[PDB]
Design a protein around this ligand. Structure first.
Ligand SMILES: OC[C@H]1O[C@@H](O)[C@H](O)[C@@H](O)[C@H]1O
Ligand SMILES: OC[C@H]1O[C@@H](O)[C@H](O)[C@@H](O)[C@H]1O
Ligand SMILES: [Mg+2]
Ligand SMILES: [Mg+2]
Ligand SMILES: [Mg+2]
Ligand code: NA
Ligand code: NA
Ligand code: NA
Ligand code: NA
Lengths: 1011, 204
């Protein structure tokens, strides 16, 4: 009687969902949130055996352990144990789309556990087992006898084992099916795994117990008073001597407390709930909760007798906060929020989708450290501990039901079918009943990518009836449907409309003012951070700050979903789509994070931190104006740190303490700054510093910064002409310039500098040539594949145009002698099938001081896709340990993603000039560089550059960063101009026009020499 | 305009004059203009300009060259944006083509005299025996920028000897969102710091 193929059966004998319980038998333990004797963990070593289908599971297993089984750790994903491969598919379902049927060959994981139960647990009360997460459906047996069934991989399933357990040894048999009808609602773009991946527990409750409690906090207009309302429901024998006492604790203090017997108010003609009671406590001047200041209280619910005997007690942290959308704005405690959020999948590079406290806290610290204040549980309820952490550390959470069917056609084929209303209903209602008490949860989401069906509207209204305290949102069907309180598009651009039929993505600014529209707009996903991305990120924030109703969004996404594999030698490397024999697979589309699977920041994370600062600065002569973007806190743990520097050389500095009220401003008068003398550019740089360490930050943590170009002094005193003069030698094949020790050679057959010498030492391994292409970035490739080509993607437009295989034809190559320098003039014409794509005219001027002045002037056909770049490149022979440059840094920065970078003198090891993106591509570029120093070399001008041991060619031919091999020497890419990286989304041209090399005619000048 | 350098060299087929000036005011160096004139066998002068602008001096109204020509022709022919006066931030209506008009139509009789008649995106300009080629903007009339800024009414303007030529490699926008406060959009402000344009002067 196949239950995994019937959307009408989502469980069998499963107990009701509810807030986190622990059944303390001591109120003091409850208040202090200390471990509970009535809550045992069944985590550890279990017995596991894999099978090709449930029909292959031998009966013996139900009562007797299979010897063929192995001992494995639980929770875990059997794919991670190597029992079968984890699949990575984006939209296209991993199985054949034929609801509600699943493959006959359904990987079945057989988990078993022998453990014993204290005799005292069976002498009284209720003993139940709790599975926080089983992917994707499963049957449970206790001591050979069958208990129940459950579906929905992201919420806990609980069963009453009281009548199955015996004192002493007991055995659990858990048959977990990888696929099930529930899989139709679990089509998220992530690795497709299975098994018991979340904690297993054993909870003992009294017979007469607390079965549920709801905490609510309502305030007066100025939040000076608040009423805490606690609705409590019980089970078991009802008796008058029964009582419930809800007490509110602020630390060791008891702010309020109320006691009352069961018996609710009259609700209808039949009376009221005799098995419930509501307590209402008053609270004067409550400490409000926010991501800024996570002020919490402790609510302790006690079930006892009138004579004072405790029966059992439950509790939870309470955060006094009011969330409401009013007059088009999302208000948190009366103030309009600006969501600096990010989407976060529960992913571990080694543990699969199994979460642990440590990984969680880590992520949370990183997030807050990079100025994030909100997170979206994309796309399913998260592990229970997570909400607890966000509560205490301070993070606005979007709790999202486990429902995605993006693979269906049309997308709402299931969500609009009343036959599936039941399955969906439970994934929404059970989430609410579980997490509704967490203050960090400020918004409820109905799921992800599932079109817009009636079911969504029905469930939308349910939440609104059940819990008025939180707004509901859903992006399906166009982001502004009748099923959402917030216009929550995903990847809708700032100024550009994407008029798709039925579900267009309007410019977020245009969206707010559409006729009739009045809701607040917060993108549920934006700034696809896939690889070298996040370009144009600053534009979003510029807009968020200017438009009251543009209240932020959630970046996509937090961490790369890469898994660790090992080569023959036993070395670890990051793997993605297909790397497990999984097929069909979606390449590297599972890696869209701001950090690598091991939580190592990507360059882009830094840009995010900067744009999401909570302190804005403006400069007016001598005064720096600091404006606070906080809504509640005062800048009581910050001090401004300034410093003036002439092209890297510091001159003055100081530090003023910050005393800014939320929303307020503070003026800082810098002392008569040092009057520069030497030629150069003076740069004022301010940094906000947190002197004291917090719960999430180290001491001296930097929360914000900003630069300003002070005065400038154009150098007029041109160089003192040296008396030496370069000598020009002429072959029929070469032009050789010699000066003292240095030797220059221009191959008259190419028109390029083929070699240089500093003594009997060669300097180049590859001629110094022009370059107009780049190792395609993920954003340049989009969804274009080997067999399926997307002619629109930048990479394809370039390929087709012939940029990647252009033959450089020589038009001219002459040499002349001047009063004090040799002058080589070149001129090339890159073409493809006749079409002249680029023309590069240059003039090299080597003078007495031994400096080579390269002047380039390029032309680009006004009918050939704009080049990825316009510069020069060559393979240097040396391999130095450091790289020093005066320009934007220290981290990788590109035209459309360089706001965070600062202008100064930077020095780093050659390796840090290379960004280890799992999928290799153009990287490590640094813009606005006036001086570059590598080995004996020094390049001067106003260029961009990237320097590493990998050629653009290798990079574009290599698929994984671990297959990259260092090459002889160091590859230098010096660009006069570089196209933006884009990133508004990674599946369609997303580079803003102002960042496209389209000028037609470009000009840059370089000065090569020996330092 | 202080002279920093002015040298001449001989090449395999052309003379090469290199200049470099530093416009200042009370010590402060406002602009630096490096140029190289290349007159070759075909008798064409190739002027290559490379200007620098102090990143702390109000963005210049323009970046070009000018001189008072001796001739006074009846027509003006150019390949670029026209036929009417057009500026960077107000040239959408103009079309690219070959335009020919009488010298007078290259002057806009605004009652209150000011910079006028500019034409952007010009690749070829023909006046009298002259022809200028490149990718510049220009305005050509019988009134000097100086007279124009010293004169209050268009009827007090007197034609001057010859024809004044203003060839800009870059011209700041005219603005107009309102006429009582800076109204020129940032993208139209000569702020790049370093500019570069090239011209070819010759006889048609
Ligand atoms: O990067 C692709 C993304 O597309 C979004 O629409 C979806 O909600 C995400 O879960 C992910 O699939
Ligand atoms: O989620 C929105 C989009 O995400 C992309 O990754 C996918 O290739 C598209 O087909 C669409 O699903
Ligand atoms: Mg079922
Ligand atoms: Mg998806
Ligand atoms: Mg900025
Ligand atoms: Na806003
Ligand atoms: Na993705
Ligand atoms: Na402070
Ligand atoms: Na005037």
């Amino acid at each position: 009687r196949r239950d995994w193929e019937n959307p009408g059966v989502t469980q069998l004998n499963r107990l009701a969902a509810h807030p986190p319980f622990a059944s303390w038998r001591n109120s003091e333990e409850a208040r202090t949130d200390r471990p509970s004797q009535q809550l045992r963990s069944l985590n550890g070593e279990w017995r596991f055996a894999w099978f090709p289908a449930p029909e292959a599971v031998p009966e013996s297993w139900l009562e007797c352990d299979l010897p063929e089984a192995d001992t494995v750790v639980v929770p875990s994903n059997w794919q991670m144990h190597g029992y079968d491969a984890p699949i990575y598919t984006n939209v296209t379902y991993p199985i054949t789309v034929n609801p509600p049927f699943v493959p006959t060959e359904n990987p079945t994981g057989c988990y078993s556990l022998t453990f014993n139960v204290d005799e005292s647990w069976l002498q009284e009360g209720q003993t139940r087992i709790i599975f926080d997460g089983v992917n994707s459906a499963f049957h449970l047996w206790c001591n050979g006898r069958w208990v129940g069934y459950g579906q929905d991989s992201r919420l806990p399933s609980e069963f009453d084992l009281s009548a199955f357990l015996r004192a002493g040894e007991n055995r659990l048999a858990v048959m977990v099916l990888r696929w099930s009808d529930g899989s139709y609602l679990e089509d998220q773009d992530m690795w497709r795994m299975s098994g018991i991946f979340r904690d297993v527990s054993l909870l003992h409750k009294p017979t007469t117990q607390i079965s549920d409690f709801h905490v609510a906090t309502r305030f007066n207009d100025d939040f000076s008073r608040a009423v805490l309302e606690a609705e409590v429901q019980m089970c078991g024998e009802l008796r008058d001597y029964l009582r419930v006492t809800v007490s509110l604790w602020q630390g060791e203090t008891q702010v309020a407390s109320g006691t009352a017997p069961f018996g609710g108010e009259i609700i209808d003609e039949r009376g009221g709930y005799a098995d419930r009671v509501t307590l209402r406590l008053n609270v004067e001047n409550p400490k409000l909760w926010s991501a800024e200041i996570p002020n919490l209280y402790r609510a302790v619910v006690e079930l006892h007798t009138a004579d004072g005997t405790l029966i059992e007690a439950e509790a939870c942290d309470v955060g006094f906060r009011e969330v409401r959308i009013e007059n088009g704005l999302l208000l948190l405690n009366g103030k309009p929020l600006l969501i600096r959020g990010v989407n976060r999948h529960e992913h571990h590079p080694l543990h699969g989708q199994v979460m642990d406290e440590q990984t969680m806290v880590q992520d949370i610290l990183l997030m807050k450290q990079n100025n994030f204040n909100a997170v979206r549980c994309s796309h399913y309820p998260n592990h229970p501990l997570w909400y607890t952490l966000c509560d205490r550390y301070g993070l606005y959470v979007v709790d999202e039901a486990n429902i995605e069917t993006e693979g269906m056609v049309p997308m709402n084929r299931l969500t609009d079918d009343p036959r599936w209303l039941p399955a969906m209903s439970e994934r929404v209602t059970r989430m609410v009943q579980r997490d509704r008490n967490h203050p960090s949860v400020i918004i409820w989401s109905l799921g992800n990518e599932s079109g817009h069906g009636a079911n969504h509207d029905a469930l939308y209204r349910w939440i609104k009836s059940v819990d008025p305290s939180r707004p509901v949102q859903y992006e399906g069907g166009g982001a502004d449907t009748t099923a959402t309180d917030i216009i929550c598009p995903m990847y809708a651009r700032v100024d550009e409309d994407q008029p798709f039929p039925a579900v267009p993505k309007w410019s977020i600014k245009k969206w707010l003012s559409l006729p009739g529209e009045t809701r607040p707009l917060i993108l549920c996903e934006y700034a696809h951070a896939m690889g070298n991305s996040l370009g144009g990120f600053a534009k979003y924030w510029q807009a968020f700050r200017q438009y009251p109703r543009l209240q932020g969004g959630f970046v996509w996404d937090w961490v790369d979903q890469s898994l660790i594999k090992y080569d023959e030698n036993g070395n670890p490397w990051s793997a993605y789509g297909g790397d497990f024999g999984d097929t069909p697979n979606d390449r590297q589309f599972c890696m869209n994070g701001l950090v690598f699977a091991d939580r190592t920041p990507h360059p882009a994370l830094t840009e995010a931190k900067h744009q999401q600062q909570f302190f804005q600065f403006r400069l007016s002569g001598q005064t720096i104006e600091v404006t606070s973007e906080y809504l509640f806190r005062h800048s009581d743990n910050e001090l401004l740190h300034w410093m003036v520097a002439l092209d890297g050389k510091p001159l003055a500095s100081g530090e003023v303490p910050l005393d800014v009220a939320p929303q307020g401003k503070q003026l800082i008068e810098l002392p008569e700054l040092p009057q520069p003398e030497s030629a150069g550019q003076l740069w004022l740089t301010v940094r906000v510093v947190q002197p004291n360490a917090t719960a999430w930050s180290e001491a001296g943590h930097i929360s914000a910064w900003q630069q300003w170009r002070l005065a400038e002094n154009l150098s007029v005193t041109l160089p003192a002409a040296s008396h030496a003069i370069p000598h020009l030698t002429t072959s029929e094949m070469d032009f050789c310039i010699e000066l003292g020790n240095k030797r220059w050679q221009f191959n008259r057959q190419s028109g390029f500098l083929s070699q240089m010498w500093i003594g009997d030492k060669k300097q180049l391994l590859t001629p110094l040539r022009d370059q107009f292409t780049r190792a395609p970035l993920d954003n340049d490739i989009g969804v274009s594949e080997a067999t399926r080509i997307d002619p629109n993607a930048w990479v394809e437009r370039w390929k087709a145009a012939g940029h990647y295989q252009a033959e450089a034809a020589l038009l001219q190559c002459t040499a002349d002698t001047l009063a004090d320098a040799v002058l080589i003039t070149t001129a090339h014409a890159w073409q493809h099938q006749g079409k002249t794509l680029f023309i590069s005219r240059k003039t090299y001027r080597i003078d007495g001081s031994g400096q080579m002045a390269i002047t380039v002037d390029v032309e680009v056909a006004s009918d050939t896709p704009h080049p990825a770049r316009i510069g020069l490149n060559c393979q240097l022979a040396q391999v130095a340990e450091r790289v020093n440059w005066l320009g934007l840094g220290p981290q990788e920065n590109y035209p459309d993603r360089l706001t965070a970078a600062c202008f100064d003198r930077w020095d780093l090891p050659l390796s840090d000039m290379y960004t280890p993106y799992v999928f290799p591509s153009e990287n490590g570029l640094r813009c606005g560089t006036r001086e570059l120093n590598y080995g004996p070399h020094q390049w001067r001008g106003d260029f961009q550059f990237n320097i590493s041991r990998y050629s653009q060619q290798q990079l574009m031919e290599t698929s994984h960063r671990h297959l990259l091999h260092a090459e002889e020497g160091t590859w230098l890419n010096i660009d006069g101009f570089h196209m933006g990286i884009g990133g508004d989304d990674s599946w369609s041209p997303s580079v803003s026009a102002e960042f496209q090399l389209s000028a037609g005619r470009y000009h840059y000048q370089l000065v090569w020499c020996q330092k």
